Amino acid sequence: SLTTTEVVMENVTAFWGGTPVLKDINFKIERGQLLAVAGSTGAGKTSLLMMIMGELEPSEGKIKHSGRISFCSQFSWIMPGTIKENIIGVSYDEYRYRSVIKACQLEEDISKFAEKDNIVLGEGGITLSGGQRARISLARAVYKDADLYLLDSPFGYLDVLTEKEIFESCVCKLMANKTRILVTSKMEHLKKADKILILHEGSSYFYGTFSELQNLDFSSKLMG
Ligand SMILES: Nc1ncnc2c1ncn2[C@@H]1O[C@H](COP(=O)(O)OP(=O)(O)OP(=O)(O)O)[C@@H](O)[C@H]1O
Numbered sequence: 001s002l003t004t005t006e007v008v009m010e011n012v013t014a015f016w017g018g019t020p021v022l023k024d025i026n027f028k029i030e031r032g033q034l035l036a037v038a039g040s041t042g043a044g045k046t047s048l049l050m051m052i053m054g055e056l057e058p059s060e061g062k063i064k065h066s067g068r069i070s071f072c073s074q075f076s077w078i079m080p081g082t083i084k085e086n087i088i089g090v091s092y093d094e095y096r097y098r099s100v101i102k103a104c105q106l107e108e109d110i111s112k113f114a115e116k117d118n119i120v121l122g123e124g125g126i127t128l129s130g131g132q133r134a135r136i137s138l139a140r141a142v143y144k145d146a147d148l149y150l151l152d153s154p155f156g157y158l159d160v161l162t163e164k165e166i167f168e169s170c171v172c173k174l175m176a177n178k179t180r181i182l183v184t185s186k187m188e189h190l191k192k193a194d195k196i197l198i199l200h201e202g203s204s205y206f207y208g209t210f211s212e213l214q215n216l217d218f219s220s221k222l223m224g
């Protein structure tokens with residue numbers, strides 16, 4: 001056999017010097033796979049993403065990953081400049097740009113404005129709706145040519161329909177061959193995931209496929 005593992009955590013424990021934020025974490029992710037990371041507020045989901053990114057180092061165990069990371073943060077900031085510039089930053093690629101703005105449902109929002117994608121934003125994008133900031137932040141993350149996409153609750157401030165459609169068009173369709181970790185509140189997203197990690201108070205409550213989760217609970221109460 002030929003291996004294509006992209007990310008490995010082996011017996012990982014980490015502290016932000018008291019009680020562990022993550023303890024005995026084990027998982028692997030293969031190239032092109034979607035891992036859904038679930039769990040209640042404060043369970044350690046963003047801290048896990050931080051470990052992959054080098055911001056949080058393990059006290060015990062090993063993290064194996066090599067590749068470019070694209071991160072969509074919670075409370076993601078809008079920088080001064082146009083919506084386009086907020087999405088594309090440095091590299092111009094019109095085909096990729098169009099596919100991303102379509103998949104994140106920004107086409108209509110941009111088509112309504114006078115200058116279209118060329119309307120200049122302030123710091124924070126306070127003149128945008130919360131949903132608009134969320135979709136621009138996701139689009140920025142998805143547009144980046146990366147080897148690992150860390151999508152940290154990108155749908156939180158979206159209505160249920162908009163969330164469903166963007167999960168489909170963006171996470172599932174546009175990003176089908178991309179190694180993705182999605183931190184998500186939804187059972188529907190767990191069903192479509194290649195793997196699921198449920199965290200609870202810093203440790204793994206469940207790791208496995210959706211069939212395996214189905215065979216079991218707490219998860220049924222925790223998800224929307
Ligand atoms: N940079 C940091 N420095 C110190 N403590 C942190 C840091 N980031 C998170 N924590 C703490 O670690 C715990 C886990 O937080 P984390 O952000 O990983 O939770 P989460 O599961 O992503 O929660 P939510 O669903 O609310 O985003 C929290 O108590 C938090 O206060």
Ligand SMILES: [Mg+2]
Binds near residue numbers: 152
């Ligand atoms: Mg978080």
